[PDB]
Amino acid sequence: TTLSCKVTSVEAITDTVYRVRIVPDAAFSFRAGQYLMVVMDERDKRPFSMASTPDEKGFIELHIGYAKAVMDRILKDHQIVVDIPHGEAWLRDDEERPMILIAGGTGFSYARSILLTALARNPNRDITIYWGGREEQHLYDLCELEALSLKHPGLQVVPVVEQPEAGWRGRTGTVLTAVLQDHGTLAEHDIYIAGRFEMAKIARDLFCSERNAREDRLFGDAFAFI
Numbered sequence: 001t002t003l004s005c006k007v008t009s010v011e012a013i014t015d016t017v018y019r020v021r022i023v024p025d026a027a028f029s030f031r032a033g034q035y036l037m038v039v040m041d042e043r044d045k046r047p048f049s050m051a052s053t054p055d056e057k058g059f060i061e062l063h064i065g066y067a068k069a070v071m072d073r074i075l076k077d078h079q080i081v082v083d084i085p086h087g088e089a090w091l092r093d094d095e096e097r098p099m100i101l102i103a104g105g106t107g108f109s110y111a112r113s114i115l116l117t118a119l120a121r122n123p124n125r126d127i128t129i130y131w132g133g134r135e136e137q138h139l140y141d142l143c144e145l146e147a148l149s150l151k152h153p154g155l156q157v158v159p160v161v162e163q164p165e166a167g168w169r170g171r172t173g174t175v176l177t178a179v180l181q182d183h184g185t186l187a188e189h190d191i192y193i194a195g196r197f198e199m200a201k202i203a204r205d206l207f208c209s210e211r212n213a214r215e216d217r218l219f220g221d222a223f224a225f226i
Contacts, residue, residue, distance in 0.1 A: 001085075002039065003028060007078045008059060013140040017065035020074055023058055024082070030054050031090035032117035033110055033192065035221065037083040038070050045083060046070060049194065049221075051109035053116040060084075063109045089192065089219040091117050097190045097217070098126040100183075102175055102203065104195020105133045108141065110221070114192055119152055126154040128182070132175035132195070134162045158182070176203050179211075186213035193220040201226055 005022040013019050030036075032054055037045035048070075052061035060082075064070055073080050091114045099118060103111040111129055118125055133139050145157045159170035160178045171178045176199070179186075186207050193200045200222035207213035 001026075001028065002081065002083050004079060004081050005060070007074055007080065010074060013063070014065075014137060017063055017140055018071060018074075020062040020064055021059045022062065022080065022082070024060065028060075028084060030085035032113040033090040033219070034085040034087040035110070036060070036085060038073070039081040039083050040069065040073070047086070049087075049107070049110035049113065050085075051112050053113060053120060055117075055120070061109075087221055088224055089194075089221050090114075091192075092190060092219070094190055095122070097188055099128070100179065100186070100189050100191045101127065101129040102179065102191065102193040102195070103129065103131045104175060104193075104199050105138055106196075107194025110194035111192065112141070115148075115155075119148075119155070123152055124154050125152075127152075128156045128158060130158045130160060130175045130178055132160040132162070132178075136161055136164060136168060175199075176206060179203075179207070183211060186211040189213070190217050191219065193218070193222070197222040197225065 003024040003026055005024040008023050009021040011019045030050055035047050035049040037047055039045055048062050050060055051063050101111045101115055115129055131139050139159050142159055149155045149157045158178055160175050161168055164172050193203055200220045204218055208215050
């Protein structure tokens, strides 16, 4: 569906990231983890994951920051045209397998939609979210994830920073290494990944070969394009 949407709010989370909230002119639906295309042209369509749950009733939340041109449409016109929904990496029905959500800088929107949707379905769900960035400040909604974790006993949040300051309390390095050291086997989990396509590609191979993960239970947009 091609829909024109009003921009109801724009906010600098950091200096590189915008929290953008849009309201389409007609009814809409998607599955947590799908993405939309910002229709810049008839030939220039730019993919962005819905960051909100598929029942944050009236609006769609986007985290933007190739983005500059999109921001310009958002800031000048306060309206954008979207083509939604797309993607085959949505939250599965499975009610029992423990979940692992992996977000590599730029994939937090995909992880957040799936997280909040899963917690609405079962607030006691066993969910571990990994978020990796180069520096502490790129994990821009980290305090909100920690507040959320206080309310959800099965929710564990694992912040991973590549080049941290001395004293950092989370993990250091990359997300794939944090995952391998926390888990003896990944065979029982449903795993959802967003970030650079290279990283999802290596994750897949590594998780299935060193941790016996099921490839059919490994979800991510990257796996539609490999």
